Specification:
cell membrane (chains A, B), globular, binds guanosine-5'-diphosphate, 5% strand, cytoplasmic vesicle (chains A, B), transport (chains A, B), mainly alpha, homodimer, Rossmann fold, six-stranded mixed sheet, clathrin binding (chains A, B), Dynamin_GTPase (chains A, B), 10 helices
Amino acid sequence: NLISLVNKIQRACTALGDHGDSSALPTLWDSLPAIAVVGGQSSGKSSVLESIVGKDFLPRGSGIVTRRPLVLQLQKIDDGTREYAEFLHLPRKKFTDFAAVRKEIQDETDRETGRSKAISSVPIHLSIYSPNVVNLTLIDLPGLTKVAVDGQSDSIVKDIENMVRSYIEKPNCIILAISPANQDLATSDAIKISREVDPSGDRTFGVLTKIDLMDKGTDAVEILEGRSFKLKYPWVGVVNRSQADINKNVDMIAARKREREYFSNTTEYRHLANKMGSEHLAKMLSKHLERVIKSRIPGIQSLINKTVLELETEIMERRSAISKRLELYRAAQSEIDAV
Amino acid sequence: NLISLVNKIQRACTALGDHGDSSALPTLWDSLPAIAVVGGQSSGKSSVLESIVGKDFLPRGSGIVTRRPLVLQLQKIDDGTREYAEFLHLPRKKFTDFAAVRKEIQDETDRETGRSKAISSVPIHLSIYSPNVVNLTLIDLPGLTKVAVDGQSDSIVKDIENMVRSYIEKPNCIILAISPANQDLATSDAIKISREVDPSGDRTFGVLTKIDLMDKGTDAVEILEGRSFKLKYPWVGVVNRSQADINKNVDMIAARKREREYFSNTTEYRHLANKMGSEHLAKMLSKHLERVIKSRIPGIQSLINKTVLELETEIMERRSAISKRLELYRAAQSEIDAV
Ligand SMILES: Nc1nc2c(ncn2[C@@H]2O[C@H](COP(=O)(O)OP(=O)(O)O)[C@@H](O)[C@H]2O)c(=O)[nH]1
Ligand SMILES: Nc1nc2c(ncn2[C@@H]2O[C@H](COP(=O)(O)OP(=O)(O)O)[C@@H](O)[C@H]2O)c(=O)[nH]1
């Protein structure tokens, strides 16, 4: 629920104070103890924010059809199966039919970019509350490429590793390196960049998607044993919904009763079985973020010090401006204060 | 045959031509119409060459082992099966137990590296003679990585990049861009770092790999028909042995077999498998070298240039040893003049 402080903040911020108000960008930054999820194209980010949401909602692209930021805030709810989700985009309105919030996304995206990729680097706040998922805060970054293909441009190349390394440079968001597993990890565009900033591992968890489709006479152990690309935390093995199934329409729900069936009932990791899977990770993520948020709230006094550099310190273009620039930091306190 | 000469030549240069003369070692480089196999760690490189040689012979590369620019030469022999292979590493001696070759390759490497992955840059002149090969000259090449793993210092990564880029830069050199089907080509460290040196896509040929290891769902109808990531030439895709196979020590000869009926009996691909086989890469390359050379061989004045720049060289450590360049440079042109 604390994870939802950041969110109860956060939004009410890119609600107005997404300007960068001389010194009112100083929040969606520190305030962003919130995992960033990176994965070079075809990695699997697109999917794991669907089995960590146990519901569709992303416009599917095994190449790329998601070319934006994306602040995904979750929230458990009192077992009263009122699912739904909102948007800062569309104010005070509610969705239900996820498969058409997977068109709204596909549509806000299209209000600048295209059918085959352009440039747009300003967030997309969507909060999903759902009885059967974990209180948390994600931010989707688009896949990481090195070959400028089609009627794309040729900065797309170093313009995505731009975007990425600057939602990553921020010493607050935790890195989440999705690196599929029919390729070596000594090749992770993810890990390569995950190590660029944070050679320390202080923020950074391994994901490693796709294994059912990994080789034969190979398997996945020495990472979830943590012996090859040993990570400061551990690694977390997932099985998402194969291409095989996304076309077969497969629900998200009985999808997880499938990845379950996997490691519990597949010789090779029948023993690692319990620290693996969508359902799990989250429980973990949320846990390792809460610590983070928590252990980082005397961003009060460091919150509570950028107020009087205003409130008690006053053509008139910035007086027509500090009329926004403050409400934020004040809406801030109470939103903490309270609980 | 026109090829076999190039081989027959370079063995001679860098048989004493590895320290050059500060203005006449563009001559292995010069004499380099030859294919360089340029793929990223674990791509397929190795497993492919064994498929171009019908035999085993290779240090196994999931945990890499060939980090010596192995200049692999092949030559054809009339249908009397004196199969035999011979090194420069050791003048006049011949081989048979192929693993005894594979043992030697990985016995020299160890002299110039370690066992937990290190670096050096002299070549390796392992040559092979057989009915079942087409005349070729590869220089195999270190696998393009992007994460210094474990005991590799760090400068390791971007030090392989400039080594792979080196053979490659040379305008008479070909490129074997090996890249596996189970990852969106827009993350081919290969295609990326090919199109680097060769924006003309003129001396690059395509190579899919691991296609049985693709996902029940997707396939490659699109790249082989050359309608997705087209080159200039057709894209040949193949099925070397999988870990799986290397374990039951799947007799090499059982290679080509395997895939043929794969490629033949597969619907998706069916109609292509005559322009597709492993065997038919060699053929298709060895025929493409021919032209390459008969094109360039007026790089016969690249010589009469240095033999003109030294014939007129008009303690005694150079002189007496300049002529041991000419007579081992010059009469190469007479060995070219010849045919
Ligand atoms: N079978 C299987 N397929 C996967 C897995 N992860 C990703 N894929 C497939 O990869 C393709 C798209 O990956 P995507 O979710 O879009 O990741 P992204 O391309 O990096 O955004 C689809 O075929 C996915 O089903 C997995 O764990 N198992
Ligand atoms: N099934 C299958 N497996 C492959 C293919 N190519 C490579 N492999 C496997 O991929 C792994 C690495 O291949 P390898 O040749 O050693 O990579 P490289 O030598 O660094 O290019 C090994 O386990 C191989 O058995 C292929 O075309 N099909």
